[PDB]
Symmetry: C2
Subunit: 474 residues, 2 copies
């Protein structure tokens, strides 16, 4: 509720947390245990005996949709929809001047995240149990922790999740993939104040809300921290940094302050990410840590990415539950909107609508590839009717195979924008998308007598639904 | 401002209104005069000497974007954008219950629209100067006038623009093309109270706001009349009908009350519409007028449809100016969004964006065919950069021809939903769309050195801009 600690005591009570006092190595061993754990439901893991470190390593926190929901003050995967409704409403708060005639950040003075402090001369990052994920990974990599930066002229600050490679006792690599967020504030600062070092701060182990707030996309009409307030219920308590004016959550577990030396870059050695493949070496800015501030008995929050199901993959499933309502408000025909993890969290989407006229499927298609920005890179879209479970491959494959004619019902559009790292494309940043509607064809779409689908009896599915537990089948 | 009369006195002062006291026939003669008039700017026309009628015929009211703007209490085509901003904001008024803890219709008792009244026995529609538009038209056809209906269970009422054919001294044809609006309230009433007559009322010559409100699409989170209030500035004054509970604007010029006899239908003889072609005969419900109420010295508001530029065509150009901001809020890359009349008000759209990455053009493409419902039938979309005037065919054709490779830069998608009346399609209600992006190609989209476009000097275009009037060239 207020900070991570409280979230873990809550989870531990609800059996959602497990403590591995046994000796475990943060060098690819924690991943293995976490992987198996996440691959089977599993609670959040808290290793308090990392081989060679004093900081317990906390991972797989949002390894279940349930826990993701809870982290947003909802305690119900379904409730996420309410968060979608909110997000929509936040976009248009006030009307234009023409017809207009008709949650602040609580800054504290002291903060537990500044209980212990070390700077410059002695800021050994080697003391932190930063973990290595896969055997061919370059080096230890910070995976969580929200990076905080500020523009050269905008008062508002941004929270970003960028993985950080350990290249020195006090140097990390700042991998700002996007052309927005922290990456924008930097290329902008370089303009306004060329040569002068760019201030940067990373907060590890903040309250679930500030974390999830940084994850969920929010309208520019609201500050990241602000959103966290609505989710949490109360205003988020931040605190001034030491070497800069940036603001980091006061309850954070560990906070890294430093800067980015204009021009200083470094090759981000190979790393395996959500796709399940290793990223090829690339150059990126290097973060210089001049200050490490933490709590007493602070725990290190960390995660990993690999072939899905992934820690982030599940976070995305939980996060897609919030977009559904935002998507429906736009296309009331949409019943369910789902993006299976196997499809790398965003590469494929299944949409089930209530078809009300021939050709309808194509509209939802274009809709998905254009409406929200988080679905511009998905290259596969399957449109189905409301009598199929978008989340059950048996239902979807049935639809594809019974109510579809490949050549006739497939829509291929070329030269669309695509993820720069999607090696499977013909050219970096440019590829094709495929839409396949498997909706019942209406007269016009077909000249044949369509099949009468088997529809279960509501009362029966309801009766055995109650007697089910009495039938000790499992 | 308050009623039509006031709008005409305003226009007549501003030279936007002309009175044709000369004898003119409402049988296709008024159209001819109006057509030429509209085809050259021209003011609204008010024929006060229709051959064989006592009611002056008022047409071509919104024959100019200027006048459309004015009719919305803006007096500026640009201001329409503010109306778009408003429309967007009206969609999401209040937040969900979860995080919630943090313009009525002035009904009068009397009304000028009920100053003169006739019913049943004597409700001759032949007294009204209903005009015939084209030589092959079936019969006189009411073209304006908002049809008011109410659902069998929803308190809210709808305003609709449906053309009405004169089939009797007191029978009109109710052409509810859509599957919504009045057409929905009828097929719904038939369910709730089968056999019982469906109440219907048509108001001719209402205040420009109520008219334009009925035209512009508004979110179901607001009543048609309500919207008119914001536009007008003051709440719209409505008044109870005589033979039903429907509410019509009290300042209306003429009001037709009656019902629709379940099952009673009639073939809507051929008529030429916006496309510039004659519609083929079709069956539709028949409106029985049991009551005709009007003002003293009431004028008949009427219009027509034919090959564009059309009275409605211009209304649409003015109405598209409001969607631009609603479109931009969604795709900030969109600079200008225009739909030329020649393309039948909606069949073609030109979009100019600020391309920020390869393949971008395709996104705005899908965006147009899916975002708003008023652009689902457009089958042609041209995407251009911000250095071209979307409203100047010279600029657009230049773009198409210089920065595009037909096969490479054209996107064809088949079996999309299309207007049931678009005879040019392979099958009714089903057709294909073509997207052609003529945006500068970026590396990846091409392997050739793209051309450096000629860009005018801002200061020069600015200098001759001032000295222009001094240069008596025209």
């Amino acid at each position: 509720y207020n900070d991570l600690r409280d979230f873990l005591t809550l989870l531990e009570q609800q059996g959602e947390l497990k403590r591995i006092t046994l000796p475990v190595d943060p060098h690819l061993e924690i991943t293995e245990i976490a992987d198996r754990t996440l691959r089977a439901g599993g609670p959040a893991l808290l290793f308090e005996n990392p081989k060679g470190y004093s900081m317990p390593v906390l991972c797989n926190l949002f390894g279940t949709p349930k826990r993701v929901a809870m982290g947003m003050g909802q305690e119900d995967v379904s409730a996420l929809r309410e968060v979608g409704k909110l997000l929509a409403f936040l976009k248009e708060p006030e009307p234009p001047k023409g017809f207009r005639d008709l949650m602040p950040t609580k800054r504290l003075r002291g903060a537990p995240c500044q209980q212990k402090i070390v700077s410059g001369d002695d800021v050994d990052l080697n003391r932190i149990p930063i973990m290595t994920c896969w055997p061919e990974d370059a080096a230890p990599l910070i995976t969580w922790g929200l990076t905080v930066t500020r523009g050269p002229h905008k008062e508002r600050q941004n929270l970003g999740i960028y993985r950080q490679q350990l290249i020195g006792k006090n140097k990390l690599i700042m991998r700002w993939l996007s052309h927005r967020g922290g990456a924008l504030d930097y290329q902008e600062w370089c303009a306004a104040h060329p040569g002068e070092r760019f201030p940067v701060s990373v907060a590890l182990g903040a309250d679930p809300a500030t974390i999830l707030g940084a994850v969920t996309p929010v309208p520019d009409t609201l500050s990241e921290y602000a959103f966290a307030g609505l989710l949490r219920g109360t205003k988020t308590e931040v605190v001034k940094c030491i070497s800069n004016d940036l603001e980091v959550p006061a309850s954070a577990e560990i906070v890294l302050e430093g800067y980015i030396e204009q021009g200083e870059t470094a090759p981000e050695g190979p790393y395996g990410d959500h796709t399940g493949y290793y990223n090829e070496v690339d150059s990126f800015p290097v973060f210089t840590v001049t200050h490490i501030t933490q709590r007493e008995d602070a725990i290190y929050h960390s995660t990993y990415t690999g072939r899905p199901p992934d820690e982030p993959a599940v976070l995305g499933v939980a996060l897609n539950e919030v977009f559904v309502p935002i998507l429906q408000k736009q296309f009331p025909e949409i019943v369910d909107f789902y993006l299976p993890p196997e499809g790398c969290s965003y590469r494929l989407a299944v949409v089930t609508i209530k078809k009300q006229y021939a050709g309808h499927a194509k509209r939802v298609m274009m809709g998905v590839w254009s409406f929200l920005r988080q679905f511009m890179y998905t290259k596969f879209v399957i449109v189905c009717d409301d009598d199929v479970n978008a989340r059950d491959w048996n239902d979807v494959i049935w639809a594809i195979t019974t109510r579809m004619d490949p050549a006739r019902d497939t829509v291929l559009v070329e030269n669309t924008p695509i993820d720069y790292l999607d090696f499977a494309s013909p050219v970096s940043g440019l590829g094709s998308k495929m839409g396949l509607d498997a909706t019942n064809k209406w007269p016009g779409e077909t000249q044949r007598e369509w099949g009468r689908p088997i529809k279960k009896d509501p009362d029966v599915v309801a009766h055995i639904d109650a007697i089910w537990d009495e039938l000790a089948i499992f």
